[PDB]
């Protein structure tokens with residue numbers, strides 16, 4: 001696991017509902033507005049691993065974290081995302097393929113000691129959608145998650 005996390009960049013992904021996360025866990029894909037797509041695509045080219053750490057708002061927990069497998073691609077079968085009020089699929093950028101590293105949950109109470117230096121040292125659970133997490137802080141956060149024996153780490157390693 002630590003090899004997968006080496007020198008990774010971590011991003012806090014705040015979904016407004018559980019459905020979108022369930023979709024992401026079932027289909028291994030993710031999407032977002034173009035401006036955020038551009039940052040993720042640029043970060044994928046330049047970083048050894050791009051880890052998304054998911055947290056559904058109000059849930060009090062992280063729902064897991066996944067690693068970008070590639071830049072975003074267009075022209076796929078439409079996914080039934082639950083989008084913010086007033087957003088349509090036409091406003092979305094492409095779709096990202098993601099390999100889940102851990103699908104198990106982590107409550108905020110087990111991360112109360114981890115503070116994000118890149119967000120005024122507030123607890124890592126606190127942050128806006130997209131807030132980047134400092135390397136060591138993000139690494140420790142991922143290591144607090146329960147082990148998930150259902151994930152094939154070699155499938156993700158071969159893509160690095």
Ligand SMILES: O=C(Nc1cccnc1)c1cc(C(=O)c2c(F)cccc2Br)c[nH]1
Pocket residue numbers: 011013014015016020021030031032033036037039040081082083084092129130131
């Ligand atoms: O990707 C997201 N945010 C970010 C910001 C900045 C950089 N990287 C990433 C993000 C997507 C969401 C969504 O609910 C969402 C989704 F699940 C699927 C499709 C579109 C949408 Br909209 C929340 N947050």
